[PDB]
RNA sequence: CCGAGAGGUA
DNA sequence: GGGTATTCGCCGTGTACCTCTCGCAGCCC
DNA sequence: GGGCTGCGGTAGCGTGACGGCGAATACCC
């Protein structure tokens, strides 16, 4: 998180004792100063995607974590929306499909 | 005069000093501390009121709302103590506090709040104290040991030699507060003074003076006296007080009035100072060279320029004198800096200072205290004005202020909790005074520097921590909360308070498990002064002095009851009479001595007050007048045992028992033993198992009564009266009239505690020691507990001992015991194991407790019922099954395809493994008690319902017996009313017993009392209803459990271990012994009257181990049983009471002066025969601690019996039948069975289980483990040539897995050969080193 | 391995390896997302100290 | 079936 | 420029056995 | 309910070992 203050107005001990704050980044004795260019170039940012570590995108490959299909790799055909998903599950004979919630399976 | 039960068996009392103070209640430390903690205490000192009035009223950050406090109250506990120990919950009370919230408006400092509210908030539970001084925390019964920490206040410490490696001493000065930051001043070998706070970095000590808004001139005015130089006609004549001439050499001429007083070259004598002070010599003329080393005092600016000529604390020279002379400054102030008396420490410390003003001083202190974060004026000022000066973050106690004033020789003993400017200045001045010579350093072990925390203080501190955390939470909720919808529980949280107080009572270095196998062990574990704990010193660091007995321990802390081992002298026990001062210090009683007649009044002295007066000895010879019969008597002045005058003394010791404790005031003949064997005797007497038949120590000290009555393992009668009904389980007493309440008719019902488990797996058991229908007095014992006999204390049993070598079977310290001991079952004791079986909810379904058990038959099921739980009374051995528990076995992990297969086609597994609760190895016994506990969401099987109905009928039957026999006593009072006032006798027995009131009685106080008892009876009706229903609720419900367990079954076995070659018996004197051979009766050495001896000790244990007191105990016990045999002869060939009372009076007169005799002409002619029935097993003799029986009285008592005065009887051998030469000592020694039993220490293992991280045998006995063939034994085998023994020892037998499997196969093949291989833990070593960044390998073949 | 109950008697080494792996995964994600200089400096600093 | 804390025996 | 001399922070501090209790709280995802 | 994560707080807690030893640096050239 970034803060802008002056130590005379509110002290660094008071900022350090704020409910929900671990610590200043120090590198040594004093807390670090980020230059104004970093604040300026983190004004407009976040360009690329909705990148999403460890949440499955459709058109990908997953695994199943519970139930009677636990241990079965699956293809996203078409999740129903932003509520559940539908999966092309494998078997040792024939692949099936199922509309399941998002707790009983996780991405590979 | 005595009781009626003191006339059961009155002990023969030696003892010459008439006692003035009776022995106090021994558990007063614990109970008085906790009663000080919880008390509805006005004015707020000391207790919970002090913590609340410290923390309340809560206001927010000017948020126009302020919570205030009214009162507190603790409800009743929901669980009584017996069902608490059985059930496993705490024994605690709810804390119900009535807080009051008032909420201001915006801009109402004096304006009335718009809303008030006052509810009763529940803030957790605090555990109460059982009336014996114990807690019950989670089933277990735990004791808090009183601590012993450094008192709050200033201390001046030497550290004389270890510093500097040069022999120069330093002198530091530590300010220890009760709560807040520490503070230390100290020197350095450059003679500069330094300060440090909380053992941080070192600053020069005057910078904190600059923090206190002091200039350089003010500091120099404080720490130095002025020496005046005046510019005058020539050469700058000087005021010279002759006192400053102490110990100097005249390097210049000392003259005035044209008279050379002291010449240059010579030193200045005190004669010279007296001549100058007599001649009134003040102004003297100096050379200009004398100021060339001196230091200017204050700042002088030149008035022409306004610029500084010289700064303060600058050494002067001739050019500076030429500057100040031409300026106009005629006056020069200087500093007396001489190395003998007034050193220049502060001036040099100012020269070291890198600062000048207050701001740079506060910046430097802030960079010391909290580094890294940037120094700013506001934060640094807030820091230093909160470090020592705020009521919140710094507080000396009142104890701290009293010590901090007494050490500074201040006048008051009250003050502020914070420090001040003059406090720090006086500490630095006193430190400099110690540096200069006046005053001396305070030693640390002095018990006036050394204070006792107890239960109340430590629990109050933890409750204070809980309160400050909850007020931070409340001030968080108050500045953010909405109004008006929150009552004072959305702000509050009972979680931190209960979490803190249960972490203290559960997990602390002092809330420790009670050593409970003895009445004595309880009463000397509660009276314990630990030096360890938080704020205390650790075991494996310190030291010598804190382990060592110091002269202030006389009568405060016991010198001989301390454990040998790693902590000697740290876990010191407290003396008998030693109370605790209101400041927490150790006060001990003394007899006030106004003059030659010693006064009969007592007066308590702390440790610092002892050194001022001069205290007499306890056994100082006085005769009926208070007059010391000598003019010179042993006393002690300042820890110095020296002989002083007859009238210079001020105090006298109260009793001669006061130096020691109850662990070793029960050792008779203590004055005759070495201190080592007294220590071993006390620490073993704490460890004796309660035998099956308590057997009255013949050689006692009289303190057995106080240990029995005070330690609550006997049933002392609350109100005296008449026995109505004695059964083996309850005792019901009808109360005498003058101790009786008018309402609530009242009979005292004492439910005894029968055979049940103690904390050391011994048996605690109370037995009724009174008859049916016997007068008992208030304060008299009614039930003898474990190790007690008729209200006395009886740990071991007293046996016929003989001191001789008997064919080597008692070689080093072994003890050879007859078969008469093991036949009589007189050391046969009872041990009890609690075995639990838990039913956890696991995978593949939870587990059944059914009797349907695989792979076994009726061989185990023959002792199980319909439910699978063993019957009460089953005589089980090792290897049986007590609770049959079965598990869902098969562990297949079938595929998801097979999961769909078993899900559609519907086939269960239905395989199972035995996991029943089995008897451990070696043990036998008897199931005496089965408890079944069940989670409330779980159904009950049939034996659980059977025990539930059993407990329900027992509860209803107990309450019905309470109501019926209380109704019988109530009707007996109604009958006592109905004797007079309209007697209608045959009108009474026709109508039923319910309405005895409606017979003829007028409008008097008797019918008023009948209506009192009638409303009592209707109260008992409604109370019977509500208590039966509440007890049905308690029995019918399921209890809370650990999350994840269904039902718990707890079986209580009861093994009866007798005695065998291998156990450890010992006396009271420090004579330990492994009982070696359990001989038959015949081989024993019998005397010429035919009587076999029982136990044959070793005489070589007497000259080395200098415990000569066991021999006097042997002879005096022999005299005691001689009197007992004579009474048995006079009573067996049975006579009338006259000759018996003559012989009993001869037994109780005995020559010299005692405190006893007896008023034996008064014992009703039946209390003599009952006393002779209790004396026929030997006459009990009180030999007190240091005022005991002399030799000649033992000889005179042996002459009262027909025994020889020598003490030694000729003995024959049972083998050869012929007389031993040189007749030997036989007598009765009271020998104890310690609970280090050989069938608990014995263990063996061929091949059991193997540890997991390294394939090695396990450690312990309870886990079936092997012996640690340790490091030094490997060195011993290297010291032989034993290579192959070592090779199979640390590779095959221990570690190499394929090696030991091939070895076991070779041994059953009959082949003795090992495949050596490589040990596995070495491979684990290689994987750990290789799991670093280190390559380790094995090279070429 | 678990102690007798429903909870595992955990070992200190698995805490240390879990701390190192969590910090290294966060550092991979921040080097992917092109965090600024001081943020990835702190990330590599905490990784060094873990 | 590993660690911490408390106590004890030699 | 190096030659002491003080400070600092790292090492280390008996063996074997036995017993007991207790071993995550919070929490905002 | 649970995966995680290391003081809980709008600071401060630590404070009763002691020796030896060798490197790092302070003071004074």
Curated annotation (Swiss-Prot), chain A:
Q: Which UniProt keywords apply?
A: DNA-binding, Transcription, Transcription antitermination, Transcription regulation
The residues of the intact protein that this chain contains are 55 to 162 of 162
Organism expressing this protein natively:
Escherichia coli (strain K12)
Q: Name one GO biological process term.
A: DNA-templated transcription elongation
| Domain comment as written in the entry | The N-terminal domain contains a vast hydrophobic cavity that is buried by the C-terminal domain. This cavity may bind the RNAP and become unmasked only upon binding to the nontemplate DNA strand.
Q: Which family does it belong to?
A: Belongs to the RfaH family.
User: What does this protein do, in the record's words?
Assistant: Enhances distal genes transcription elongation in a specialized subset of operons that encode extracytoplasmic components. RfaH is recruited into a multi-component RNA polymerase complex by the ops element, which is a short conserved DNA sequence located downstream of the main promoter of these operons. Once bound, RfaH suppresses pausing and inhibits Rho-dependent and intrinsic termination at a subset of sites. Termination signals are bypassed, which allows complete synthesis of long RNA chains.
Protein's UniProt name: Transcription antitermination protein RfaH
One MF term from GO for this chain? translation activator activity
Q: Name one GO cellular component term.
A: cytosol
Q: What gene does this protein come from?
A: rfaH
Q: What happens when the gene is disrupted?
A: Inactivation results in increased initial adhesion and biofilm formation.
Keyword Membrane annotated: no
Quaternary arrangement and interactors, per the entry? Interacts with both the nontemplate DNA and the RNA polymerase (RNAP). Monomer in solution.
UniProtKB/Swiss-Prot annotation, chain B:
Recorded superkingdom: Bacteria
User: What parts of the sequence cross the membrane?
Assistant: none
Provide this UniProt record's keywords sorted from A to Z: Acetylation, Antibiotic resistance, DNA-directed RNA polymerase, Nucleotidyltransferase, Transcription, Transferase
Query: GO:BP terms for this protein?
Result: bacterial-type flagellum assembly; bacterial-type flagellum-dependent cell motility; cell motility; cellular response to cell envelope stress; DNA-templated transcription initiation; intracellular iron ion homeostasis; nitrate assimilation; regulation of DNA-templated transcription elongation
The protein's matches in InterPro entries, at most eight in alphabetical order, are given as: DNA-dir_RNA_pol_bsu_ext_1_sf, DNA-dir_RNA_pol_bsu_external_1, DNA-dir_RNA_pol_su2, DNA-dir_RNAP_su2_dom, DNA-dir_RNAP_su2_hyb_sf, RNA_pol_bsu_bac, RNA_pol_bsu_CS, RNA_pol_bsu_protrusion
Q: Which PROSITE patterns match?
A: RNA_POL_BETA
Please give an example of a GO cellular component term from this record: transcription elongation factor complex
Q: State what this protein does.
A: DNA-dependent RNA polymerase (RNAP) catalyzes the transcription of DNA into RNA using the four ribonucleoside triphosphates as substrates. Resistance to the antibiotics salinamide A, salinamide B, rifampicin, streptolydigin, CBR703, myxopyronin, and lipiarmycin can result from mutations in this protein.
Q: Assembly and partners?
A: The RNAP catalytic core consists of 2 alpha, 1 beta, 1 beta' and 1 omega subunit. When a sigma factor is associated with the core the holoenzyme is formed, which can initiate transcription. The rRNA transcription and antitermination complex (rrnTAC) consists of RNAP, NusA, NusB, NusE (rpsJ), NusG, SubB, ribosomal protein S4, DNA and precursor rRNA; S4 is more flexible than other subunits. In pull-down experiments interacts with CedA. (Microbial infection) Interacts (via flap domain) with Escherichia phage lambda antitermination protein Q; this interaction renders bacterial RNAP resistant to transcription pausing and allows it to read through termination signals.
| HAMAP family attached to this UniProt entry | RNApol_bact_RpoB
Swiss-Prot record, chain C:
The record lists its disulfide bonds as none
Q: Describe its PTM?
A: Acetylated on several lysine residues in the presence of glucose.
Q: Which residues form a coiled coil?
A: none
Superkingdom of origin? Bacteria
What role does it play?
Answer: DNA-dependent RNA polymerase (RNAP) catalyzes the transcription of DNA into RNA using the four ribonucleoside triphosphates as substrates.
Subunit and interaction comment = The RNAP catalytic core consists of 2 alpha, 1 beta, 1 beta' and 1 omega subunit. When a sigma factor is associated with the core the holoenzyme is formed, which can initiate transcription. The rRNA transcription and antitermination complex (rrnTAC) consists of RNAP, NusA, NusB, NusE (rpsJ), NusG, SubB, ribosomal protein S4, DNA and precursor rRNA; S4 is more flexible than other subunits.
Family membership, please give it: Belongs to the RNA polymerase beta' chain family.
Q: What name does this protein carry? A: DNA-directed RNA polymerase subunit beta'
Q: Which organism does this record belong to?
A: Escherichia coli (strain K12)
Lineage per the UniProt record:
Bacteria, Pseudomonadati, Pseudomonadota, Gammaproteobacteria, Enterobacterales
